[PDB]
Amino acid sequence: AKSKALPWLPNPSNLDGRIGANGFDPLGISEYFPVDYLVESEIKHGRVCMMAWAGYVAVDLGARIYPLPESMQGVTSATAHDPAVAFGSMGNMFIWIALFEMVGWIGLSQTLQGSGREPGDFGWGKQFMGKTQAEIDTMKLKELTNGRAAMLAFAGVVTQSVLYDKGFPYF
Amino acid sequence: DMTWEGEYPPSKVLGPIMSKMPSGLLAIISMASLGVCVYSCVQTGFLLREPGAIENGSWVRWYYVVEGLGGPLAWGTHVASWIQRKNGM
Amino acid sequence: AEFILPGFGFIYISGWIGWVGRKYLRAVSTSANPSESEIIINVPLALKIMTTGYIWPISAWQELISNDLVAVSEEITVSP
Amino acid sequence: AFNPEMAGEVFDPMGFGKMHEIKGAFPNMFPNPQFLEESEIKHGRMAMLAWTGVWATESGLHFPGAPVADDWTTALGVWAREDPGGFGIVLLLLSIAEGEGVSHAGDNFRGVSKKTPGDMGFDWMGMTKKLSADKLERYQTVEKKNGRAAMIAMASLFAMKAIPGSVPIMDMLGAN
Amino acid sequence: TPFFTGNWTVYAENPDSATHVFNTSEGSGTAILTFLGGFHPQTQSLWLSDMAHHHLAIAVVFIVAGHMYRTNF
Amino acid sequence: MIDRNSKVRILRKESYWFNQIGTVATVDQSGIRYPAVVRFESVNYAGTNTNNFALDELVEVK
Amino acid sequence: YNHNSGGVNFKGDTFQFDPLGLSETYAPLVPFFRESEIRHGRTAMLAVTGFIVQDFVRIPGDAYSFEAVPKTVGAHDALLEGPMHQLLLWISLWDIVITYPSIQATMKGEREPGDFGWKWLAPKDEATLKKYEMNELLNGRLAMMAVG
């Protein structure tokens, strides 16, 4: 059975029946690493990047909140981490991020040990996910599809911005 | 369970992940890891042997430190490749 | 001269004594009274056996490779 | 013809080739004949190359753009510090070849190997299929005998340098 | 600041001078973690800065080693 | 086989003559628990040179 | 020769060629040999061409200008940075992500040596397809020799 994405290569089997399975796993990481771990990672990376990209672009198009610490004046999205970490913004958000991440680690452990928590599920805002499994699945693919794009998007923004010192267009 | 007999151990002893990896892949990884470790050592050696400029322990670099850990991994990976080969996978 | 050369001397002489002793014990072991010949030595035989120790290095090696020196688990052992 | 020098009888005066059969003690501590055979072959093959090397260097041959050294006994260090890259590449290949020799073969020390001592799978010219059995065996004997000769020669070289006058004929040739 | 920034070398700068008199500020330094080696000239004992660095290193090694066995996770 | 004048090797671990050779003197045929009577050329820590063993504890050596 | 194609001189007549007998001595590796043969051939063909085109025309840009690069051979050194590095990256990525996985498949009997999913533009007839395959192999051998 050949993969849809790479017709000349065999299909990755362990990834079958998963959201966003286009048959693309040329190096076969799935055959070796636990799938639930991989799935959780893809989702987390995507969600983080989605927000990261938005933040980068937003600040670059102005957006600074009010009142703004003086040290934060005249800072691009890039070259803002250090001013912020000095002020205390980064540290004050790191604390909460850490808390959630630690509890999440417990969830991941239980998921891998077999508890029933689907990878990436934190039971948040499921009300808007629809009722029919079909619509639920479409929503999930929507998140994943946007997420994959976001990962690539963020990379471009940060790399192009620093390399050529440019603003929003071609950030 | 892990008790084994013969001339080669079963793949179960290589863990829950490497037990499914092909022998060749492990070999490639092993060689690469050893290379990184050796490179790190040689490069760091120059830093330690360069006149002055290493005061306050400036010779210690985060990348080289991490790279140096490839050496032990190289051993493990090369041993694992052999086990996988004998096991047929 | 301080240690190596004198050392060879000791090894040669010591081996000579040990080899000849083992030879005599094994030789008289098959006699009418194997225990009387240990308290009252048969001087004639002893002298003969004693003279044959000058080539102990060669003899020993030959006996080792002939499986005649080291025994094979047919010897008494402790209960455990 | 086997051991034409020994009138056709195996030459193992010391009996090294039977020590694995000592039943009294030291279990699996003595090499099985297979290990010994392979070692003899490798030693011989390496000795032959080494001897040619010393001879070539002494005769005055020097590869284009190669490390320059005078003492054949100290040239290795020069190469290591003059051309570190080249040294490394050769060393890597040598190591791979050495490990591949046993990795696939098995344990010869305990006599459980599958390979025929001496086979490193390097018959690239396919002579094993292009030649008659007798020819092959003849070449094998030639390789072993010539290899043994080289080993003695390497010993003579070492003795010459270590023990002055140990080898007289070479001194006549005007070596050292 | 140096710790989190990654510029750890700062904590090893300005080691106590060889003319430092113990229990006093004469000839003192500011270093807190160093690998000088040897003994304090006046007290003829190992440098305190080195001991601090020693225990810090040992700490990391043991903490890492304590994550080797399965414990309900 | 265990029989008069046969030579056997003791297989009783508690015996002073374990893994040693002895000569079977007589084997009783009345159903006693330890029928064979073996004699040794070496005295034990007590000074005896004989003991009675069962046929299973004895292996013929020849 | 029975298992794989080729063995035909450039003229077209049968010409089994393996003087060293490498195939027999190292049979289990013949699949790799075939893949490399095609790889070297395809690469050679592209290299033979282009060289000529380098001479005729150049990509718009100063570095690519004939004045900047009078000799096609000199381009390697002159454009080592920027270009060359870009090509290196993409070619290397391809080998690690595509070529390597593909080889593993062919070593297990799931891929025919040389296949990378470009048969979508290939003739349906098996015979004509076979002819084209032969054309590729022969041309590749010629090109390799042509390059040097």
Ligand code: CLA
């Ligand atoms: C790819 C081939 C290759 C190999 C195998 C080596 C190997 C080596 N190089 Mg080298 N080198 C190479 C290419 C290579 N180099 C190239 C292309 C260059 C560019 C010029 C250099 C430039 C260079 C310099 C400038 C120096 C070296 C040095 C060394 C030695 C350092 C050992 C060390 O510190 O590791 C310690 C790390 C470990 C993990 C130790 C354990 C690993 C083993 C025991 C060490 C040996 C590696 C082994 C032989 C690899 C071959 C077998 C492999 C399949 C396992 C080592 C023998 C240094 C040296 O010592 O020279 C005197 C040195 O100064 N190299």
Ligand code: CLA
């Ligand atoms: C092995 C093949 C090969 C290689 C290594 C090069 C290398 C080079 N060419 Mg060149 N070229 C080739 C084939 C090749 N060419 C062919 C077949 C043609 C058309 C017949 C050209 C036409 C061409 C022009 C017109 C110019 C170059 C130039 C150059 C130099 C600048 C970078 C470059 O590629 O320009 C860009 C080259 C192209 C845009 C040619 C198209 C690319 C080929 C034809 C298709 C490759 C297949 C496909 C892209 C595979 C992609 C998959 C990828 C992920 C692996 C560089 C030295 C420039 C220069 O300065 O020369 C000195 C220049 O002006 N080339």
Ligand SMILES: CC(=O)O[C@H]1CC(C)(C)C(=C=C/C(C)=C/C=C/C(C)=C/C=C/C=C(C)/C=C/C=C(\C)C(=O)C[C@@]23O[C@]2(C)C[C@@H](O)CC3(C)C)[C@](C)(O)C1
């Ligand atoms: C309690 C409760 O229930 O609350 C609810 C609230 C609410 C809102 C309903 C919920 C939600 C969902 C959320 C938060 C959804 C938000 C999702 C988000 C934020 C999705 C962004 C994707 C960004 C992308 C795709 C970027 C593309 C960017 C692309 C493709 C680019 O090319 C950018 C580009 O720069 C490059 C790289 C190169 C440049 O040269 C050119 C340009 C500029 C073009 C939840 C989860 O249900 C919870």
Ligand SMILES: CC(=O)O[C@H]1CC(C)(C)C(=C=C/C(C)=C/C=C\C(C)=C/C=C\C=C(C)\C=C\C=C(/C)C(=O)C[C@@]23O[C@]2(C)C[C@@H](O)CC3(C)C)[C@](C)(O)C1
């Ligand atoms: C048998 C055994 O013991 O194996 C153990 C070994 C060990 C090490 C304990 C293990 C572990 C954990 C890990 C992941 C170890 C790896 C690496 C380790 C030790 C730690 C991680 C990351 C460090 C980073 C990312 C660097 C931050 C450093 C940064 C961001 C900086 O460089 C800051 C700095 O750049 C500025 C901004 C400017 C420069 O002018 C100054 C410098 C350059 C300093 C293993 C592998 O799991 C198992």
